[PDB]
């Protein structure tokens, strides 16, 4: 499998960007939470610290320079994060300071639903991948919050031991979950069973900002101590840890899509790993006119060559990026 662990590393080079936007006004902060697309990739979905959620027409944008959004929405508070759902194109949750979770319709911009259980700060919301009701949230109240799309109230709740950061549904399971904790842990769950975990990940230093699947078998999770890992499902600690980047402060983002993993830095760049090797893989710079990157998405069209993806900064900035 080394030859194969080369050819992956190098099959890019470079990148192009495609498009530039901006997230803003009054030269406020404009940072960028949350990048995600929906369930066909034709529209993708922005969300920050202005309150605003601005959908975009992905085929527009990449054609000409003046970028309108489709469709905009409000929140009463700072927008933490955002999910698009796998089965109902339309169908969009966000997360926010207040502790809400919100249903929308991202192209009317009604909401369905208003979820008002957290008493704290709202970090993480993720659709079930495999049952159309389910959704998951997490916060710094220290608990995960199920919900069902067709019920105002959680149906069942799992109690950290510190503040949940990120919540994320297995792409294998519609019962398998995990989340990153404050207490610097990865934890991964059954929701059929809660008392009880399955496994407890350990190895930062720091909380556990960011966990996405790379696939139902391998988890990679981020924290402020410049590294991310790489964890196998099965194993308490890690196969891998990731290196280049620089993340001592700030929530960065992270995406995977198959066997590739990007995330932000503190140098103001986007870092591209294969998972199968920890060195850096590429860099794009993001211009400045201590910035960072604050989120990315990949274009995860499924049936194709997942080459495109979406990183914003710190100044608001929005790439859309082909790597060559």
């Known amino acids: 499998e080394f030859q194969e662990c080369l050819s992956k590393f190098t099959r890019y080079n470079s990148v192009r960007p495609l498009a530039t936007l901006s997230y803003a006004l009054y030269n406020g902060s404009s940072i960028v939470s949350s990048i995600e697309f929906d369930r066909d990739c034709d529209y993708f979905a922005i969300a920050g610290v202005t309150k605003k959620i601005k959908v975009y027409e992905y085929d527009t944008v990449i054609q000409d320079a003046i970028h309108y959004p489709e469709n905009e929405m409000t ?16 169908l969009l949750a966000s997360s926010d300071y207040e502790g809400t979770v919100i249903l929308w319709d991202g192209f009317t911009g009604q909401r369905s639903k208003v979820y008002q ?44 031991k510190a503040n949940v950061c990120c919540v994320k549904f297995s792409p294998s399971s519609r019962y398998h979950l995990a989340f990153g904790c404050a207490d610097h842990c990865v934890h991964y769950y059954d929701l059929r069973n809660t008392k009880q975990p399955i496994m407890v ?67 103001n760049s986007l870092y591209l790993y294969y998972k199968g090797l920890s060195k850096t893989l590429l860099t794009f710079k993001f211009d400045t006119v201590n910035e960072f990157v604050s989120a990315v998405c990949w274009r995860a069209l499924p049936d194709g060559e997942s080459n495109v ?12 990026l082909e790597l060559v």
């Open 75 to 90: 929140c009463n508070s700072k927008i933490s994060c955002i999910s698009w759902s796998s089965y109902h194109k339309n």
């Open 309 to 320: 993806l979406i990183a914003a900064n710190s100044q608001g900035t929005i790439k859309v």
């Open 201 to 267: 990940f350990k190895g930062h230093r720091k909380a556990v900002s960011y966990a996405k699947f790379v696939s139902g078998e391998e988890i990679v999770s981020a924290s402020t101590d410049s590294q991310l890992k790489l964890w196998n499902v099965g194993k308490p600690y890690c196969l891998r840890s990731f290196k280049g980047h620089i993340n001592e402060k700030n929530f960065v983002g992270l995406a995977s899509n198959g066997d590739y993993i990007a995330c932000g830095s503190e140098n």
């Open 117 to 160: 259980e957290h008493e704290k700060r709202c970090w993480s919301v993720d659709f079930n991948l495999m049952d159309p009701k389910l959704l998951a949230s997490g916060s710094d109240d220290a608990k995960v919050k199920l919900w069902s799309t067709n019920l105002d109230n959680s149906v069942a709740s799992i109690e950290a």
